[model samples]
Target chain A: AEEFPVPNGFESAYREVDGVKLHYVKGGQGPLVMLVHGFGQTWYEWHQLMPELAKRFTVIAPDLPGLGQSEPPKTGYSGEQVAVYLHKLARQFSPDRPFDLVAHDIGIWNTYPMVVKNQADIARLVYMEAPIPDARIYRFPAFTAQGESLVWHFSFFAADDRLAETLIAGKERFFLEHFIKSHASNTEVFSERLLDLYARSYAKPHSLNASFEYYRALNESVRQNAELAKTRLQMPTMTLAGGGAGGMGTFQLEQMKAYAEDVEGHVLPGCGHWLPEECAAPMNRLVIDFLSRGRHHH
Target chain B: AEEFPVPNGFESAYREVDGVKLHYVKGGQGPLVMLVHGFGQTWYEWHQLMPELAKRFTVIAPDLPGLGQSEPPKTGYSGEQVAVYLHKLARQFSPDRPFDLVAHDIGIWNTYPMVVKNQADIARLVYMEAPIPDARIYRFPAFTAQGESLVWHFSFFAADDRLAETLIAGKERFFLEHFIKSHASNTEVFSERLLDLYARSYAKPHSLNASFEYYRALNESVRQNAELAKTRLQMPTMTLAGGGAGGMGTFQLEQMKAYAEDVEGHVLPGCGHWLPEECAAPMNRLVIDFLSRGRHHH
Candidate 1:
């Protein structure tokens, strides 16, 4: 935590929630705003957006379990399993008040369940750059060169026998570097320093395997979402996605609209899958703006 | 050829066809029986079946281009392209005879196109253990653990940027050993010596990448198969699948039935994906019996 820079007033802390050690950065004051980072990154992905959001609200950015400094959960890695642990973590800070939630990539995978079950506790929600597992994922072409070019890891990462982790064991830096570079349209956004930091955390023992557990557990996540989505999200919701090469583009927008009411969507131009870091300025602005006026929504 | 034992009368030779150097094993004499081996193994996969078939009919089992000693093709690796190269090779042996065609795994992929276009030139068709690239592949689930367990490499191997080859580079033996072991029901069918033999070929320069070209070219294969399937296959066809774990089971049978008339389907009881080696006794007997029946189908 001390290795990476953070804005003034931010401090790192740890808490044990549901037998899992949680590491988070908390600063500023007022309504709580939780920032959830995506795969191939830690809470540092929110560093640029943190101070800006901190100016108005208390910003809490934490590394998800088995990622960065956080400890892996003893339980399953499914969205529903991780969501309840995070839900209780949020309630600890503001037991009587509703907090705003923001997530990207696998963060969306874990937190969507939290938002669904605790609709009354989260004031507003912002998800970015990835689609939740659903029936539509099955329709994705298994043999398209175009599809393979963009998202081959969806199947590769979800491999059952540790095939991916074993192949990627000693070469984590090479694999993650190429993965990050290839997924971003604004490739310059992730400097060598940023790549090194993310790779360092991923190379830690069992980190890659534990992180991949989310993908491995996607079938359970999909089933959980199917059951929870029987009722559309009543909270004010917004989704933002990168619109450039390798971006989810309108995919997240279309999927979000399926499970939410009073939902707003945006596709940021000149960006890719790494929206938090690649398009931090616009994404942070969108989150602040969306959450600021969201109490009035039905 | 001296490293592995072969039945008497069998001889190894090479031919230059379509600017690609082809290596093949040939012996016995009656009618032409051309064997096409799959991914992971070369013509050696048919070593057991070859001796039996060679006793009654001439058997020619060639290592597909870039797989064994054969040079990578100058053209694309699409089923259509490689098929033409091999088809011309078969014609060189018996220019006027309609030779029997047998293929498995990627062999099924490369040679199916040959059988389709040259219905008269190929006497009978036998495809085993894998489905041809077509619209049916799109329906395969992307997230199910079951699907991922059985064939995660379909996407992994087809990954753009040489992702699979790069990861499996120095670990060729490890990957191939596990791959063959996991895909077979009769695990003892492949001894450590046999594993080393197949792994040595894959570890050769550009051999792994060149072999993966078949998967990378699947989009073109699917498109080609789509256009050619406009007229169903008129030749007598046999589809064989292994009924055990990791096998195609009835998948190849169902798929071939969709694209061929006068099709015979069989799922071998205790076999896995490696039908040629895993069920050699039954498979060879079945093939010899099937081919012996007077070629009198409509």
Candidate 2:
């Protein structure tokens, strides 16, 4: 499989974090910013924003364990485990200066640990296109009136790891394409090239199984996050939701208030689940505007 | 589908009621007993029990609207509407007398309306393997540490009709087969012969969408059932659950107690969602004994 090539002008590298070899990309140079990718796609998911953000800040994006170019171990992708590994990778930029954290989808799972432990240095957090991992709120979205159907994948991934991997060993593209095509507001909104790239990476040997591992740890993440969410994080928090049909849309805002004291929620008009790539200009603007405000230095 | 040959001594029949013609089956000779079918299934699902029951009682079974030989209405199948329709078809055995009701899966949805209003005569009820349709009680079973996944299909069915139909136009057999073959405790328990018959019916054009209409009526049924459950049903009720992995098991009885009085519940070891086919002998015995002792007999 042709590895998804990083956008021109970005640097690709790997680091040993928490006994796991992590592959990530770094670009731009200014206030340190860490972008964490979620289930399915990798650091490449941030290509649309990387170049733009690189102009204003030093950006570091990493592929979660068991995904993308990252090494796939048999287990240990729980949110806390993932978050610990992510902190090791993020610290590469600077141990003393806390970077701004931006997390997407399941990346938010790993983000919880980062926000909880490294609060003083981390300036702010922007959660993108996913709900909080509060296990106490464990309603199946598939049953909800929401127009999205990709959530049923969660049950399949969680219940039968063997079934999820063996059943689609060679058929990875079919599911990935379905998730990308069905999750977004419209097919026209996403480029075929971008989605296929995502499919190819997840289709790698054991890559799909590794992806399902993320889901396997989801319940644990929800509990861990829900428990932690009880005490509001001291850092400023912002969430950007996709406004069109099939996106988390406005629910992102409604749900965040319960978890954090300081939250700035906004909707990206016409955008869907694939946040950064959907419509980058306005999203970038909102993100940059949020970042420029910086941390409250006492 | 050489079309699952019906058992000896039973009879196939049809009746016109509630604006749509219904195809049905009947057998036996004593008091009247009614069998209502569930999603992706027809009256023939009771083929194993019908012959045995026919010997003890005049048993009546029918294909729900828009299914089997039953005429498709392109509308109206809420719990009340279906309960009303099934009641009309049951009348053919003898409108003057009340009949015993045995409902499964979606059949239970309609049966709620029956027990709520027609209790003067529905001698008793046998609710076969499936959860009580309580929306408030939902937590993704994958996460719940409880075991039930069949309910997610409702959300898929309830979402966009046009999208579901067109997406599965040629692939209906795959899902219907998965539902029957996988949802059971083990694939060997349910005969391929029976599931094929179901798949053939659902694969027909506009057929899958028609079945989805059953889910479209789900929320309305929950509300209607909740309102009536407050009265605590007087009819003696029995439920048979699957005892192995993936079974609703005793949860059915526990939940039923909240809605009715004088209820009996049991589980079928190594059985699953396809309770009738998996444990016919016990299921038949249970039904026979429940019928043998009429409600509060002298």
Candidate 3:
């Protein structure tokens, strides 16, 4: 495949959602697959796996609202709101066809509700190493009354544009390093070009606050997920954990099982959080297997 | 061990270096272990491991000439020059006792020459995964000529304080993210306290440029190391790789061996570039073993 940044012969366009110009990439034919990434990351995280997935599925990956190539909006952005926008994009891409969905990290948390509420015509679901709203395993103290959580609450609050603006004003590298250095397996994985792109995407005047809104939206979603837990998922689902010692494990799978009727999970051995990049071959096999099993019933 | 920024326990002291007030952390007692961390990361990178090391050794980990708690000087702040300042600090700590040295990432690359040239009295050496002067492995386009036969011309220029100041001014998060994200095994590894410390450290004006000078100094060191490579190290050395798939591995071992008469290496399995943090237990063990061996010889 061609180098990722140069547009790889893939069609690119934009649509206004919640007053933000969301950019997207589309390729291939057959059942549509919508790939969603997490915080501080763009559609580029899927670059390693996109070409292969595109051969069999219509892969429609968008730079989520206020992130990546997407333009920042004036106000009112949340993960749930972004999900609603994605639902619209899903419909625009395949009005007549139901789509399969794959999401990683923060994106999985946002997309899970859409799959549960039947907002999108999603045929199958894959949640990759994301927090599964199980307070016991992945609790945020800021959201809770304790205020003693180990996670960076500031990053979570950065979702509010005004708050993020005040907090992240001259300290972009601080947040960037917190996110990247803590997640990557090695320093070499991040190249100057890659860092430059990330810096450009985030260093923009209002981008930090807009990006933080995704987490701010999480507060709302956490409450919604608590309510949804009373209900169960109606669709087929699979959760894959990149099982490097420090990575997200079956926590998401167990929480998902409370909702998903036929939830299955596998831990990719020897892989860190960046499974798609570090262990792409195994991830491709696992994803292909998950989709194939759903295909049989479909 | 207590956490850093330790509720009034963390105190900052300054020393004059090239007309700049260089800040550093000092604690515990026994043998001395002076630490130097990589780019963007502050003395805080050693936070988790420091108290433990301090239990056995009087640890003096500085922010280097232009980074962390250190004040940025106007000019002449290369790694070699910083080595001279560190030499002064080492002398003050113990007029007679030679100290054990531990450095990571850029720290190792920048200060290796000081150890080789005997400017710093290093009794034992622990070099975490850092790029050595070897052209074969660390060849980057900007650092190498088109034909790969010559080094980049910019490598010969003196360190410029302006670049660091400009790059870090409003984009601290970008630099921080680039460093932290690469070393993180998962998102959870990045804690809020850590990010806060990083932000506060780089928030100092002109510090980023001083940190970047470490790289500019690398060019000068490349020339120095070429000359010093003829002299073998008198100290016993222990080098480690993070053992993640993309880790430094035997290359670092080979580099150390080429310069040191008695050298050994180990790659920590399932660890990232932040080996001292990600696999502190093992790193501490290895470092203890290496230092003990040096003591035996002394």
Candidate 4:
């Protein structure tokens, strides 16, 4: 943690949420901004954006349940369950005010349900790099080489009988390194130190297994999201896409438009799926500007 | 190869078919019976069935190009190209007589094109355990747990930039062991020696890459097969499905009937995806009875 220092005034702590110990980094003051990370990362992905967001609002970035330093959930890894836990955590931090939510990849998957179920608790939402799992995922090409490359891991990790965990058990470093690198448009964007850091976390026993739980539960999440999609997000939403080879690009933008009424979007050029680090400056700017806006008063 | 001995009177040799030196096992003298093996296996998969078939007819089983002892193809790994290579090799042995073909898994995938293009060169056809790439595959579930488990490897292997190879490298035994076993209803059916044999072959340098080429070419094959499916197969076809869990279980029968005329199929109970080895006695009996019948005699 010292090698990659957090911003000054930032403090790391853990909160017991529904039998699971959730680790989070909290800093700054005023309005609550909870940063939820995606697969292959912890709250550390927001290290670059934290300082900037911290200058104004209180930033609370927690490792997703059963990921990073967080304890695995005893019940289920469904998006609804994860969302409820995160919603309670945010409320614990600021009981009087609704918090803004920023999520990427699977983080968005887990939080989307929260935004719908507890619409009044979340002030705004910023989701990046992934689409909410639904029938649409089935529509993605399987036989095509390019289509499969971009999303093969979705099926790979969701395999039955812990198939991905078995294949990736001892080869965590090799799998994660290739997986992370292959998703980024700038392959060299991630330093060896960053790769090692992420790999080390996943290399721990049962880490890969827990991580895959999120994907394994995607089928359930899809049904949950499909039902939740009936109640569109009431909060202001901003969707970001990394417009590079492996990135989601404008894909996320299009998906959000269908799910939210007040939605805005951007495609960060030269960035891949790793939008947080790949295009941090532009991403940080876009996110802050979007979150600062007041709700439509019509 | 010595760990698992072949049938008596069988001889192993190599033949350069279109610059790809093909390794095959041949025994007994009579009508041509070419057995094409599938992924995660070689001609050795037919070891038990060989001696039985050899008693009545000459049996020739060749490793798919770039897999097992067969040399990598310099041209392409498409089903059409691979079929052409195998067809020429069969013709070299018996120029006057067309050979009967039996294939499983990806073997069935590669040989399907051969049967359609050179209809006269092949006599009867027997395929097991897999469906040819076509528009039908897109209908398979991606978000569902059971659907993903049964065929996740299709998308995983077809991944671009050698994604599956990178993950499976150095962990060949672990990956293949779980893969072969998981596909079988009777997981205990495959002995450690047999798993090691198949793993050792794939562990060779550039072998995984070469093997994945067959999957990578699936899009092209889908297009090719779609066009060829129009020209319904002329040969008398018998499709077998392993009825146990993880097996295709009558799925192949349904698929072949759509692509061929005069098709007959049977779901072998107690058998898994490893039909030849998992239920060898029943499979051998079925193949012989099916093959012994004159080609419709119509």
Best by DockQ: 1
Q: Give the per-residue lDDT of model 1 (tens digit) for A185-285.
A: 89888888888888888888678988788888887888888898888899889999899986988998899999998799999999999987789888888
> Which candidate model has the greater lDDT, 1 or 3?
1
Highest lDDT against the true fold, candidate: 1
- Tens-digit lDDT string for candidate 4 (B190-220): 8888888888888886678877888888777
- Provide per-model DockQ scores: 0.41, 0.18, 0.02, 0.37
Candidate 2 lDDT over residue span A111-208, tens digit each: 78767866776788899877666643355445653333446666666655254565456556665666676677645755667667888888887678
Chain A superposition TM-score per model: 0.95, 0.91, 0.83, 0.95
When sorted by TM-score, best at the front, the candidate numbers are 1, 4, 2, 3
> Candidate 4 on A146-196: residue-level lDDT in tens?
435466577778766677887788888877877887789877878888888
For residues B8-29, write the lDDT of model 1, one tens digit per residue: 7799889999889999989978
Q: Locate the minimum summed-lDDT window of 10 residues in model 3 chain A.
A: A140-149
Q: What Cα-based lDDT does every candidate model obtain?
A: 0.83, 0.73, 0.64, 0.82
List native contact recovery per candidate, as a fraction of 1: 0.39, 0.12, 0.00, 0.36
RMSD in order of candidates? 3.4, 5.4, 15.6, 3.9
Q: Write the per-residue lDDT of candidate 3 for residues A156-251, one digit (tens) a residue.
A: 243222544554566666556545645555435666667666767776666666676666555566666777677676667888886663356666
TM-score of each: 0.90, 0.75, 0.49, 0.86
Of 2 and 3, the candidate ahead on DockQ is 2
Docking class of 4: acceptable
Candidate 2 C-alpha lDDT tens digits along B1-298 = 2234656776676677756787777777777888887887877788878877777788888777777767765347678777777776777676777778898888888777767787886777788876556654344332343322556566556655244455455655665666676567867755666667788887667557678877776776666766766677788888888886656777788888877778888888988777787777888898888877873222
